[PDB]
Design a protein around this nucleic acid. Structure first.
Ligand SMILES: [Mg+2]
Ligand SMILES: [Mg+2]
Ligand SMILES: [Mg+2]
Ligand SMILES: [Mg+2]
Ligand SMILES: [Mg+2]
Ligand SMILES: [Mg+2]
Ligand SMILES: [Mg+2]
Ligand SMILES: [Mg+2]
Ligand SMILES: [Mg+2]
Ligand SMILES: [Mg+2]
Ligand SMILES: [Mg+2]
Ligand SMILES: [Mg+2]
Ligand SMILES: [Mg+2]
Ligand SMILES: [Mg+2]
Ligand SMILES: [Mg+2]
Ligand SMILES: [Mg+2]
Lengths: 107, 140, 55, 97, 120, 190, 95, 100, 287
RNA sequence: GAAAUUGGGCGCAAUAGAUAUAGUACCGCAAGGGAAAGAUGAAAAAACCAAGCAUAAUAUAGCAAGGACUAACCCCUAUACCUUCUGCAUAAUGAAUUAACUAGAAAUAACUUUGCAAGGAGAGCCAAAGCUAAGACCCCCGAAACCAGACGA
């Protein structure tokens, strides 16, 4: 509901549109298991799409960690110190491209 | 018990996290919290229609008040802004009524001007030259 | 017992029983098991046709 | 609070145990051992259900008629009552008929 | 018993006062009806609900073109309290395949086959 | 699942000890109606739909589906590049370290299913080498199956085991419906 | 009926059904009409001709009798001079 | 031992020389390998020279010498995925670590 | 197969890659949730929610359908009636033309069952094979069949081509030895003697028209002349051609197998035959 | 309802598993009934989380919320849940609350997916495309009673 959840006013970070537009997403942090069906579509995302994504916006620095994880995560860190950790557990490559592009588009 | 439930704390905490601001034992006990949390969600969805309704009647109250400041009433103002093809809606006219009252005064003079052109128009029946603000813009 | 490219046999039966019905008969290749499932009784006709094809 | 505060001790499993590594060997002892044995002779268990599958009423009727002579007395009595209940349940109660 | 209702033919014979009131012509009548369901078929009998399904009037306030023929008009005489009937008038001609997409039916009843969005 | 027998059995409410009379009268006390202290609602009562007895999950597939499952396993292990065919399972030494280093040199896999023709005629060298190992296994050709072919990463046959498998699995295709079991004497089967 | 017996654990037939009805192998049950031998002095000969007829059963009657018999009674029977042997196979349906 | 293979720049003429060391006619690329001695000597000499053996799944796939020549001039390369990603010309904002 | 070529690149098939054929395993439906259980499928609290609907066929109190109807002897003596599995001549032409039944040897019932062209079961009271006139035209086979019943047109269709058909009788015991003889020789019993027909089948198997195995062998050319004149074929004499010694041999009654005798004990293991020499046993088995 | 005839754990782990730490304590004249529970560490010769309270009582007004709001309330909207009914806010039933336990078991026939196919099946059984295999449908508590054998004046 809305009375149990906090609320806020619609703002931007440092007047994000006025002078120039600044990409608000600093770091992505993929942690992808080498052997494991949970991070399969993550692996196919690293083999295919994370390089073209990394070139389509160079203001984002990307850390693929490749450790023996049991649930893969992506950790979006934003310019204002906000850290949104979302799971890419058992998600296909297209769904991780829409998820990572969703984290890139927002603030 | 061969397989009995281990993950049950988290189902109770799925329901009870929405109850953390209730009174009584509704914030604490699961049997009471399920009924009040279900009921709070049903009110939460049925109140979207009431949000739209109450915003619109609130705008009609604000347009009514600020049009009573200029001598008009609400139905003369809205009907005669429709009849000028100035198709501003209620939200915008309430926001002009609050923040930009010269524009709302000029919309009130445009609407009352068109109202008097309707009075003088329906007064002198038969063929007469039309009003100046009474003309319509034909689209094709 | 179809071993090979089942779609070519589906195309040849699709071009064989369509004069015997008018409409093209609805089939179902099961490319795993290697079968092909035509709707309607065409047993003696397909046994004669597959004996003409030399199998 | 019916949940445990500490994580349990870890479950080590040896996948190359003697039982796990040679599991399933001589299941095809009929189809490539010249059919001298049937694989239902390869299973070990109760003597009334080596090579046989039934529901509960059938398992208890077969249990009584095969090994019921040398069963213990209140096991024989409990088993007669179970056959009598499961008779009255399967043959008289139920939705589909 | 509330039954189905028949309507005599003198009800559907127009008068010159009606021919002057509504802009119709008895000689050379119109070809196509615009029909619009404007009254819910709930709290109505099942035959009327069926006719409203047969005419494609399941959504309210959506126009539907029918023929001005006595069979279609028989179905429209069944549900005449649930609909609105207007003639489809065509100022310009019926649209060719060149003007097929750039049409718009106006609220007056006319199908304008050259539909810009520009003022005169 | 066919060898599986589940020894789980719980007590029903007639087998659990005691509890023969009503605990309190039917209408006097304002407590609930109960008939025994051993009904499935009580702490200590019987189980309603628990597991009942040793239950055997026995079922045979047709033997053509088992033999076709062995065939299918052999084409899968061959086409995955996991089939290896020897001429004989004779090692130079009876040491396990030679066999593991050989299997790491040829990059077979972490687990090897060595298969010879019988159990009596296996050479002593492969017996002393594989009898100390967890992941390398000797089966005779009689004990070939599908679970242990999928369990092991490579499968290693010899040529007489291959001729044995062609004999046995190519027999199931082009053979009649039986009249009586194949253990009985026929005209040409043994 | 008995869905599971106490000795073998099989289905049992209702022997009344066997003693009154005739399973044809197509699935049709053949019966005799009720009252075909009672009070014939007061029946018209058209009605006497109607009562002396072998009569097929309904769909639901046929399912009811199939459930009350076991698989022995649903079986091909190659008798010598059976009078109903030509009625077992169902010729020339179009569903 | 490495599974990495590079086709030689003179693989054609070597392979024709091994066909001549086994045999010889015109259209030497169209010689049928139905004889098993022929196939074992030819693919044994190619497996011995080139350090790269035809696998069991592909061994019945060559029935002419043309298919042998088609198999031996694909670069089969084996390297770890740490060495396949991080040497794939990464942009300067991909940093890839490996806890292996 | 290009699917093996797909299997090269795909990973190894293990016990973690298996997956049933989609469509085989329907999901288990079990009464938890909003939909599968509140009343859990049974309805409202009547007598079918409680679980105690009456037996199958009880119509609520009126006399049921299966009892309002008079008993008639449809199935009165069903397990004493004789059954006879059909052998059409299209079927036996199919068996002879595919090597499954050898026409250069006499066609016993052992030879039909070992050819697996006719499956008969001695339990469920099949008394053997009956000949069937289906496919009597387009039957081109010179043959020596022994079939327990035979129609006139099947005897005509076989004897046209130079065939011999006689009708034998078998007990259920004897026919149980004729069907599957090899589980009889592993039983250890001596070979019994097949009995005579009972009183109703005796006038069947002594008539030469339907070719009894107990009939006059002086009336057979009259009966073959009768079927030759009835169906229009010049009756060939079997005495001329060169399978005649094969086409003449019948095992006599009280002999189950062709070359064996009653009282003999076949030892399948060391491949021998034990034959009695006691005189009382010979007065028993040669009776 | 025959016969001839034939031939160690995909267990439980302290409300579970035995009633059992014990047929003890206790109840009953007796026959009989029948419990509950323990958790340190190698050596004692060494936190966080159920209800319930407390920290910290209360502020006009109303199924205890929801829309919101600068703002907890004030504004507006809103006839607890289950069950049984034609219809329950119903002043009909049940429920103090927390934890743990506590209720859909299977047949022939049909259907889906394989295998083989005029045959199927590892005998027996079915077969006028069938047969074999698998998957998938059938609850819980409650009488007053009746009978048998004991225990009781
Ligand atoms: Mg009891
Ligand atoms: Mg009370
Ligand atoms: Mg217990
Ligand atoms: Mg009852
Ligand atoms: Mg009555
Ligand atoms: Mg017996
Ligand atoms: Mg206990
Ligand atoms: Mg206890
Ligand atoms: Mg607390
Ligand atoms: Mg209020
Ligand atoms: Mg009400
Ligand atoms: Mg009630
Ligand atoms: Mg009250
Ligand atoms: Mg109440
Ligand atoms: Mg109460
Ligand atoms: Mg006294």
């Amino acid at each position: 509901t809305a009375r149990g959840t906090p609320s806020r006013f619609l703002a931007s970070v440092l007047h994000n549109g006025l002078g120039r537009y600044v990409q608000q997403l600093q770091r992505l942090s993929f942690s992808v298991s080498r052997d494991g069906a949970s991070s399969r579509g993550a692996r196919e995302f690293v083999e295919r799409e994370v390089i073209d994504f990394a070139r389509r916006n160079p203001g984002v620095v990307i850390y693929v960690n490749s450790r023996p994880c049991c649930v893969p995560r992506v950790v979006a860190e934003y310019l204002n110190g906000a850290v949104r950790e979302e799971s890419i557990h058992c998600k296909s490559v297209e769904e991780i491209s829409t998820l990572v592009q969703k984290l890139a588009d927002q603030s | 018990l061969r397989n009995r439930v281990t993950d049950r704390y988290f189902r109770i905490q799925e329901v009870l996290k929405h109850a953390r601001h209730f009174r009584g034992r509704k914030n604490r006990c699961y049997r009471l919290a399920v009924r009040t949390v279900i009921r709070a969600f049903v009110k939460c969805t049925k109140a979207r229609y009431l949000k739209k309704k109450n915003m619109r009647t609130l705008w009609i109250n604000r347009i009514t008040a600020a049009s009573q400041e200029h001598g008009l009433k609400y139905p003369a103002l809205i009907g005669n802004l429709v009849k000028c093809q100035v198709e501003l809606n209620r939200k915008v006219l309430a926001d002009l009524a609050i923040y930009e009252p010269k524009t709302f005064k000029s919309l009130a003079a445009l609407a009352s001007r068109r109202r008097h052109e309707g009075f003088a128009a329906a007064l002198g029946d038969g063929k007469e030259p039309e009003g100046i603000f009474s003309r319509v813009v034909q689209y094709h | 017992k179809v071993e090979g490219d089942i779609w070519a046999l589906q195309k040849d039966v699709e071009d064989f029983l369509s004069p015997l019905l008018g409409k093209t008969p609805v089939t179902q290749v099961n490319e795993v098991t290697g079968t092909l499932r035509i709707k309607g009784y065409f047993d003696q006709e397909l046994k004669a046709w597959l004996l003409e094809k030399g199998f | 609070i019916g949940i445990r505060l500490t994580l349990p001790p870890p479950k080590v499993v040896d996948r190359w145990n003697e039982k796990r590594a040679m599991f399933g060997v001589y299941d095809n002892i009929g189809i490539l051992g010249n059919f001298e044995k049937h694989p239902k002779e390869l299973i070990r268990g109760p003597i009334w259900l080596r090579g046989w599958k039934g529901n509960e009423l059938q398992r208890c009727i077969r249990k009584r008629k095969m090994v019921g002579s040398r069963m213990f007395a209140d096991d024989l009595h409990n088993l007669n009552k179970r056959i009598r209940y499961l008779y009255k349940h399967f043959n008289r109660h139920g939705k589909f008929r | 018993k509330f039954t189905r209702s028949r309507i005599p033919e003198k009800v559907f014979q127009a008068s010159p006062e009606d021919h002057e009131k509504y802009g119709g012509d008895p000689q050379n009548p119109h070809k196509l009806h615009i029909v619009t369901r404007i009254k819910s078929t709930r709290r109505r009998p099942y035959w009327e609900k069926d006719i409203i399904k047969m005419l494609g009037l399941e959504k309210a306030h959506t126009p539907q073109v029918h023929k001005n023929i006595p069979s279609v008009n028989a179905k429209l005489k069944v549900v005449k309290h649930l609909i609105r009937i207007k003639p489809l008038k065509l100022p310009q001609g019926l649209p060719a395949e060149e003007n097929m997409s750039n049409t718009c039916l106006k609220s007056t009843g006319e199908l304008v086959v050259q539909w810009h969005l520009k003022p005169v | 699942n066919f060898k599986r027998i589940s020894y789980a059995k719980t007590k029903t409410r007639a087998e659990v000890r005691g509890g023969g009379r009503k605990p309190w009268p039917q209408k006097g006390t304002g407590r609930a109606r109960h008939g025994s202290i051993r009904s499935p609602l009580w702490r200590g009562g019987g189980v309603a739909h628990g597991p009942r007895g040793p239950t055997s999950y026995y079922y045979m597939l047709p033997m053509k589906v088992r033999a076709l499952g062995l065939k299918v396993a052999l084409t899968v292990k061959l086409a995955q590049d996991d089939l290896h065919i020897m001429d004989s399972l004779e090692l130079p030494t009876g040491d396990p370290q030679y066999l593991t280093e050989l299997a790491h040199y040829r990059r077979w896999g972490d687990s090897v299913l060595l298969v010879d023709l019988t159990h009596e005629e296996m050479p002593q060298s492969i017996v002393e080498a594989t009898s100390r190992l967890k992941t390398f296994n000797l089966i005779p050709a009689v004990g070939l199956n599908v679970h242990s072919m999928l369990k092991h990463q490579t499968l290693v046959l010899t040529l007489p085991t291959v001729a044995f498998l062609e004999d046995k699995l190519l027999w199931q295709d082009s053979r009649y419906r039986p009249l009586y079991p194949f253990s009985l004497p026929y005209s040409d089967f043994p | 009926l008995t869905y599971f017996s106490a000795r073998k654990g099989k289905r049992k037939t209702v022997k009344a059904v066997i003693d009154r009805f005739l399973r044809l192998h197509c699935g049709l049950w053949v019966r005799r009409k009720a009252g075909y031998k009672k009070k014939l002095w007061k029946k018209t000969p058209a009605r006497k001709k109607r009562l002396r007829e072998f009569v097929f059963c309904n769909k639901t009657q046929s399912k009811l009798l199939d459930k009350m018999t076991t698989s022995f009674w649903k079986r091909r029977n190659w008798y010598v001079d059976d009078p109903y042997q030509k009625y077992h196979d169902r010729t020339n349906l179009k569903v | 031992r490495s599974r990495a293979y590079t086709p030689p720049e003179d693989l054609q003429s070597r392979l024709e020389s091994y066909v001549k060391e086994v045999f010889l006619p015109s259209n030497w690329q169209d010689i049928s390998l139905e004889d098993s001695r022929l196939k074992f000597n030819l693919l044994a000499h190619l497996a011995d020279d080139l350090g790269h053996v035809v696998p069991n799944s592909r061994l019945h796939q060559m029935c002419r010498v043309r298919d042998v020549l088609d198999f031996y001039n694909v670069p089969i390369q084996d390297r770890s995925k740490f060495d396949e990603l991080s040497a794939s010309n990464l942009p300067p904002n991909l940093k890839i670590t490996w806890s292996y | 197969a290009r699917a093996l070529d797909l299997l090269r690149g795909l990973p190894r098939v293990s016990l973690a890659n298996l997956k049933p054929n989609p469509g085989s395993k329907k999901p288990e439906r079990r009464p938890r949730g909003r939909r599968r259980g509140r009343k859990c499928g049974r309805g409202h609290k009547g007598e079918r929610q409680r679980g105690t609907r009456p037996r199958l066929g009880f119509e609520g109190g009126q006399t049921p359908f299966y009892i309002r109807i008079p008993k008639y002897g449809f199935n009165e003596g069903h397990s004493f009636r004789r059954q006879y599995k059909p052998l059409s001549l299209n079927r036996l032409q199919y068996l002879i033309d595919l090597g499954r039944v050898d026409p250069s040897q006499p066609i016993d019932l052992t030879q039909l069952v070992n050819g697996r062209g006719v499956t008969i079961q001695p339990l469920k009271r099949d008394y053997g094979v009956q000949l069937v006139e289906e496919g009597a035209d387009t039957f081109t086979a010179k043959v020596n069949i022994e079939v327990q019943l035979a129609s006139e047109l099947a005897i005509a269709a076989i004897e046209k081509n130079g065939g011999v058909v006689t009708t034998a009788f078998y007990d259920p015991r004897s026919l149980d030895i004729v069907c599957k003889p090899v589980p009889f020789f592993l039983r250890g019993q001596p070979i019994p003697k097949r009995m005579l027909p009972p009183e109703e089948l005796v006038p069947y198997y002594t008539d030469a028209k339907n070719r009894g195995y107990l009939a006059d062998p002086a009336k057979f050319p009259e009966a073959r002349l009768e079927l030759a004149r009835k169906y229009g074929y010049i009756l060939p004499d079997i005495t001329k051609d060169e399978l005649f010694k094969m086409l003449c041999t019948r095992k006599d009654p009280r002999q189950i197998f062709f070359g064996l005798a009653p009282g003999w004990v076949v030892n399948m293991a060391d491949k021998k035959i034990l034959k009695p020499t006691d005189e009382n046993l010979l007065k028993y088995y040669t009776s």
